[PDB]
């Protein structure tokens, strides 16, 4: 009941070497051969084993100067740390073949900082062509400390320090149980100990382990600091991809807001206090994460120069808008051209493609970075390697901070400003000659919470003894997560001539906060894409059934590594972990319903699938179409020029079943 895939001899060996690097991540097994290789591995001597002579040499210059020390906390948002990560990445990426790649990782495991290494290695496995189709573990199994509050962490430490339970019945009262040879820890979301404002209503979504894993994967698939030359025709669509990822996410987030009675993400000002604080319960081996109190003055002394930069970055965009056509960064740009999204997105991201370069440079200040830093409310870094981490210093923690959504909402709104320059689609562009959707029905939509466990053993240090006996996997975290029942969408379509067609499904809200029905005019960016697929219509009447379990845009829960070691002994590999790893998890498709049925709408659009003109398959198997991302809702709409027979809006209601509140799953006795 987990989507499998079969696998040969050479594959399993490599995959085992790859997975070796994600276990006991913060320690070293002296007896493991990865260590014997690693200790003595000579990079200079091996120079002929890399595609890029200057990458080896650049790495070597940095490595003698000195890399970040071990145990210190790694973040890519800081110059020196990132530069070392990139130098390391290149070395992984330009290794002639697997053997060389493997050995280089061995050395790097042994000699360099843990976070820096996993960061670079993870990315490398995703980017190397010979590695395509291999599997990596879930971010939460690799970095467990970042996916869980203190309370849990500390129970784990205590149990480990005691080598078990002094009182099993007392431990039980704290949600700690022995299940055969596992220690299982129940975990509440933070609102169960902290309700310091209404945003805490959303913790089952913002603290969700999958959602946060999802953002991490997105970063890794194409990090901002690197070109996208490797992905070919997506290079000319990179900005579009950046807008759409964020647009989709904020729609999804917004949906969660609506169902907990919260409305719009609030606007903010670099020159004013920001309302909602963030009080993180994460610990770092060396420090606590930094808090932002409520009404925090973003314009305090330490931030003056920072705010001057950020304000100018924005103002420079506002200038672009005002002048329509202009030259910036070596490019004549026209805001009338829909292709300009590429520039717009690239600018807001300060990625390598903005400059037409392979890697970004220190003097090219990113807006995202400094915005993250200021809103993170940290004191000034002590030095190049010693900073006070906030949620927004890591891709694995960002979604936890309401301020993150404020920051990307603002960015998305500026891109929407650019999108106002595009002419709206006319009838002719949308009309599907002789095709009409006559009905849509939907099975009941119910959400519900359900326990989920993940391997949390990397959070813990084992003894020399335990590392040798390989007893390194006995810590699991149990947590209630959002889920929903599978559902069919029944679509009835009429057409004169048989034809190849594209079907698209979107989710959007039905009402604003006041209970007025949504116009497309104001609300086209609040539509969330559920699925696209192709069918063949016949003359007459058509019945199209599509199940939620088969929506192209979502993945299944990933499998724990231990379960993957099991499968590799059988020649099996978890399919969704191989090629669908960076999709949103299925269980989070729907926002949490209400007991009464919260009102939403399904938008179904059917259009002709002409041929395979402009065709994305290098980055994402997403857009085998000539069409903008989120077509037909990638620009302003006029309600009356828009609605055509091959469109259907269906009113639907999202229900919720069982326990309403995650914490009711975590009570003892």
Ligand X SMILES: *[C@@H]1O[C@H](CO)[C@@H](O[C@@H]2O[C@H](CO)[C@@H](O[C@@H]3O[C@H](CO)[C@@H](O)[C@H](O[C@H]4O[C@H](CO)[C@@H](O)[C@H](O)[C@@H]4O[C@@H]4O[C@H](CO)[C@@H](O)[C@H](O)[C@@H]4O)[C@@H]3O)[C@H](O)[C@H]2NC(C)=O)[C@H](O)[C@H]1NC(C)=O
Ligand Y SMILES: *[C@@H]1O[C@H](CO)[C@@H](O[C@@H]2O[C@H](CO)[C@@H](O[C@@H]3O[C@H](CO[C@H]4O[C@H](CO[C@H]5O[C@H](CO)[C@@H](O)[C@H](O)[C@@H]5O)[C@@H](O)[C@H](O)[C@@H]4O)[C@@H](O)[C@H](O[C@H]4O[C@H](CO)[C@@H](O)[C@H](O)[C@@H]4O)[C@@H]3O)[C@H](O)[C@H]2NC(C)=O)[C@H](O)[C@H]1NC(C)=O
The residue count for binding ligand X (CB under 6 A) is 9
Distances, alpha carbon 382 to alpha carbons 116, 286, 387, in Å:
19, 13, 6
Sign of the CA dihedral running 413, 416, 420, 425: negative
69 binds, among ligand X, a second copy, ligand Y, none (CB under 5 to 8 A by kind): ligand Y
| Burial per residue of 507-534, b for 16 or more beta-carbon CB atoms within 10 angstroms, e otherwise | bbbbebeeeeebebeebbbbbbbbbbee
Using CB under 8 A, which of the segments 63-71, 92-100, 103-111, 389-397 binds a second copy? 63-71
Distance from C-alpha of 346 to C-alpha of 343, rounded to nearest angstrom: 5
| Residue 550 engages a second copy in binding (rule: CB under 8 A) | no
Please check whether residue 243 is in contact with residue 345, taking contact to mean a CB–CB distance below 8 angstroms.
yes
The Cα–Cα gap between 125 and 138 comes to 13
Alpha-carbon Rg for the chain, nearest whole angstrom, is 25
Strand partners, 594: 655
| Residue 239: CB minimum distance to a second copy, A | 17
Residue 192's binding partner out of a second copy, ligand X, ligand Y, none, with CB under 5 to 8 Å set by partner kind: ligand X
Q: Which of 8, 69, 129, 167 binds ligand Y (CB under 6 A)?
A: 69
How many Å from the N-terminal Cα to the C-terminal Cα in the chain? Answer: 32
Q: Rule CB under 8 A: say whether 309 interacts with a second copy.
A: yes
Minimum CB distance to ligand X smaller for 193 or for 328: 193
Task: Determine if 269 is a binding residue for a second copy (CB under 8 A).
Answer: yes
C-alpha distance from residue 308 to each of 341, 385, 394, 512 (Å): 26, 25, 24, 36
516 binds ligand Y (CB under 6 A): yes
Candidate list 173, 464, 536, 566; residue touching ligand X; CB under 6 A = 173
The item of a second copy, ligand Y, ligand X, none sharing an interface with residue 609, based on CB under 5 to 8 Å by kind, is none
Applying CB under 8 A, among 51, 71, 162, 316 the residue interacting with a second copy is: 316
* Least CB distance to ligand Y at residue 437 (A): 13
Distance between CA atoms of 29 and 16, rounded to whole angstroms? 16
Instruction: Round to whole Å and give the CA distance between 153 and 187.
Output: 10
> Is the CB of 389 or the CB of 662 nearer to ligand X?
662
Pick between residue 35 and residue 326 the one whose CB is nearest to a second copy. 326
Residue 492 and residue 437: Cα distance in Å, rounded?
A: 6
The β-bridge relationship of strands 528-537 and 647-656 is: unpaired
C-alpha–C-alpha distance, residues 529 and 607, integer Å: 15
CA distances from 435 to 229, 492, 609 (A): 40, 11, 13
Q: How many CA atoms lie within 13 A of 474 on its CB side?
A: 22
State the nearest-atom distance from the C-beta of 200 to ligand X, in Å: 13
Does residue 427 interact with a second copy by CB under 8 A? Answer: no
428 touches a second copy (CB under 8 A): no
Q: Which of 137, 139, 144, 175 binds ligand X (CB under 6 A)?
A: 175
- Nearest approach in angstroms of CB 512 to ligand Y is 11
Beta bridge partners of 554: 584
| Minimum distance of ligand X from residue 669's CB (angstroms) | 8
Count of residues touching ligand Y (by CB under 6 A):
4
| Beta carbon nearer to ligand Y, 84 or 625 | 84
Identify which of residues 312 and 496 has a Cβ nearer to a second copy in the complex.
312
Burial status of residue 143 (CB atoms within 10 A of its CB: 0-12, 13-18, 19 or more):
buried
Give residue number: closest CB to ligand Y.
69
How far apart are CB 185 and ligand X at their closest, in Å? Answer: 7
Shortest distance (Å) from residue 510 CB to ligand Y: 11
Question: Can you say whether the dihedral through the CA atoms of 203, 208, 213, 215 is positive or negative?
Answer: negative
Nearest approach in angstroms of CB 323 to a second copy is 8
Burial of 299 (0-12, 13-18, 19+ CB in 10 A): middle
28/165 with CB nearer ligand Y: 28
Q: Is 667 in the site for ligand X (CB under 6 A)?
A: yes
User: Are residues 279 and 197 in contact, defined by beta-carbon separation less than 8 angstroms?
Assistant: no
**How many H helices and E strands in the chain?**
22, 19
66 binds ligand Y (CB under 6 A): yes
Q: For residues 614 and 636, what is the distance between their CA atoms, to the nearest angstrom?
A: 23
Piece of 21-29, 186-194, 348-356, 526-534 that binds ligand X (CB under 6 A): 186-194
Q: Which of 30, 71, 162, 319 binds a second copy (CB under 8 A)?
A: 319
Alpha helices (runs of H) in 350-401, residue ranges in sequence order = 367-375
Which listed option, a second copy, ligand Y, ligand X, none, makes contact with residue 269 (CB within 5 to 8 Å by class)? Answer: a second copy
- Binding residue for a second copy, selected from 58, 151, 314, 453, defined by CB under 8 A: 314
**Residue 330 contacts ligand Y per CB under 6 A:** no
- Binding status of residue 272 toward a second copy by CB under 8 A: yes
Residue 216 vs 418, nearer CB to a second copy: 418
Interface with ligand X, residue 139, by CB under 6 A: no
The backbone torsions φ and ψ at residue 182, rounded to the nearest 5 degrees and listed phi first, read -100, 150
Count of residues interacting with a second copy (CB under 8 A): 40
Region near ligand X per CB under 6 A, out of 360-368, 374-382, 528-536, 660-668: 660-668
Binding partner of residue 175 among a second copy, ligand X, ligand Y, none, CB cut-off 5 to 8 Å per kind: ligand X
Closest C-alpha to 424, from 521, 508, 505:
521
Of residues 610-639, which lie at the interface with a second copy (CB under 8 A)?
638
Q: Which of 48, 169, 181, 305 binds a second copy (CB under 8 A)?
A: 305
Considering the complex, what minimum distance in angstroms separates the CB of residue 177 from ligand X? 10
Q: Is 281 in the site for ligand X (CB under 6 A)?
A: no
What is the residue-wise DSSP string for 555-605?
A: EPPPPPHHHHHHHHTTTB--HHHHSSTTSEEGGGSSPP-BTT-EEEEEEEE
- Pick the closer one to ligand Y by CB: 266 or 517: 517
Query: What's the helix, strand, coil split of the chain in %, to 5?
Result: 40, 20, 40
- Which residue(s) pair with 532 in the sheet? 504
The two beta strands, 647-656 and 475-484, are unpaired
User: Binding to ligand X (CB under 6 A): which residues in 189-218?
Assistant: 192
> Helices 367-375 and 341-349 meet at what angle, rounded to 10?
50
What residues numbered 348-387 form the site for a second copy, per CB under 8 A?
362-363, 365, 384
What residues line the site for a second copy (CB under 8 A)?
A: 64-66, 266-269, 271-272, 299, 301, 304-305, 308-309, 311-316, 318-319, 321-324, 328-329, 362-363, 365, 384, 413, 420-421, 521, 638, 640-641
What residues line the site for ligand X (CB under 6 A)?
A: 173, 175, 186, 188, 192, 663, 666-668
What residues line the site for ligand Y (CB under 6 A)?
A: 66, 69, 516-517
């Amino acid at each position: 009941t987990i989507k499998t895939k079969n696998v040969d001899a050479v594959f399993v060996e490599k995959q085992k070497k790859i997975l070796s690097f994600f276990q006991d991540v913060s320690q070293l097994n002296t007896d493991d051969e990865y260590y014997k290789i690693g200790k003595d591995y000579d990079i200079e001597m091996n120079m002929d084993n890399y595609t890029n002579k200057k990458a080896v040499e650049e790495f070597l210059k940095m490595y003698r100067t000195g890399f970040m020390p071990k145990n210190l906390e790694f973040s890519v948002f800081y110059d020196k740390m990132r530069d070392e990560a990139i130098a390391l990445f290149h070395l992984f990426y330009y290794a002639k073949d697997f053997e060389t790649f493997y050995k280089t990782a061995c050395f790097a495991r042994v000699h360099l900082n843990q976070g820096q290494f996993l960061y670079a290695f993870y990315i490398a496995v995703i980017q190397r062509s010979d590695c395509h189709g291999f599997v990596v573990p879930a971010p939460y199994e690799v970095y467990p400390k970042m996916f869980m509050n203190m309370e849990v962490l500390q129970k784990i430490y205590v149990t480990k320090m005691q080598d078990g339970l002094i009182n099993p019945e007392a431990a039980a009262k704290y949600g700690i149980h022995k299940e055969n040879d596992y220690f299982v820890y129940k975990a509440n979301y933070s609102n169960a100990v902290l309700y310091n404002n209404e945003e805490q209503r959303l913790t089952y979504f913002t603290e969700d382990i999958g959602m946060n894993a999802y953002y991490y994967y997105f970063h890794s698939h194409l990090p901002f600091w690197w070109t996208s030359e490797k992905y070919g025709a997506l290079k000319e669509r990179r900005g579009e991809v950046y807008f759409y990822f964020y647009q989709q996410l904020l729609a999804r987030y917004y949906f969660e807001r609506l169902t907990n009675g919260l409305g719009k993400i609030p606007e903010f000002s670099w020159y004013s206090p920001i309302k909602t604080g963030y009080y993180p319960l994460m610990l770092t081996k060396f420090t606590p994460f930094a808090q932002r109190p409520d009404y925090y003055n973003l314009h305090t002394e330490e931030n003056y120069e920072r705010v001057r930069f950020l304000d100018t970055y924005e103002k420079t965009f506002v200038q672009f808008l005002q002048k329509d056509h202009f030259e910036a960064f070596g490019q004549k740009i026209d805001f009338h051209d829909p292709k300009a999204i590429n520039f717009v997105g690239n600018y807001w991201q300060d990625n390598a493609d903005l400059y037409g370069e392979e890697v970004t440079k220190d003097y090219q200040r990113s807006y995202e970075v400094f915005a993250r830093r200021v809103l993170g409310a940290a004191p000034m870094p002590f030095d190049k390697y010693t900073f006070m981490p906030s949620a927004m210093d890591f891709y694995q923690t960002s979604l936890r901070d309401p301020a993150f959504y404020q920051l990307y909402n603002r960015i998305v709104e500026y891109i929407v400003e650019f999108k106002q320059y595009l002419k709206p689609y006319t009838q002719d562009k949308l009309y599907f000659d002789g095709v009409k959707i006559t009905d849509v029905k939907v099975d009941k939509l119910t959400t519900f919470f359900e326990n989920f466990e993940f391997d949390a053993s990397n959070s813990v240090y084992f003894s020399k003894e335990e590392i040798k006996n390989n007893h390194v996997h006995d810590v699991k975290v149990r947590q209630p997560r959002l889920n929903h029942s599978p559902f069919n969408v029944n679509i009835e379509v009429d057409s004169n001539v048989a034809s190849d067609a594209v079907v698209k499904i979107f989710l959007a809200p039905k009402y604003d906060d006041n209970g007025i029905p949504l116009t497309l005019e104001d609300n086209w960016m609040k539509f969330f894409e559920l699925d696209w697929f192709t069918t063949k219509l016949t003359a007459g009447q058509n019945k199209i059934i599509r199940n939620s379990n088969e929506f192209v845009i979502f993945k299944e829960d990933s499998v724990p590594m231990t379960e993957i070691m099991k499968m590799l002994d059988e020649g099996k590999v978890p399919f969704d972990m191989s090629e669908e790893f960076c999709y949103m998890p299925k269980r989070l498709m729907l926002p949490r319903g209400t007991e009464g049925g919260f009102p939403f709408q399904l938008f179904v659009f059917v259009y002709p699938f002409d041929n395979k003109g402009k065709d994305l398959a290098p980055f994402e198997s997403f857009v085998l179409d000539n069409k903008p991302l989120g077509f037909p809702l990638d620009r302003p709409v006029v309600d009356a020029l828009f609605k055509v027979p091959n469109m259907y809006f269906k009113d639907i209601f999202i229900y919720h079943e069982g326990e309403r509140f995650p914490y009711k799953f975590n009570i003892p006795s």
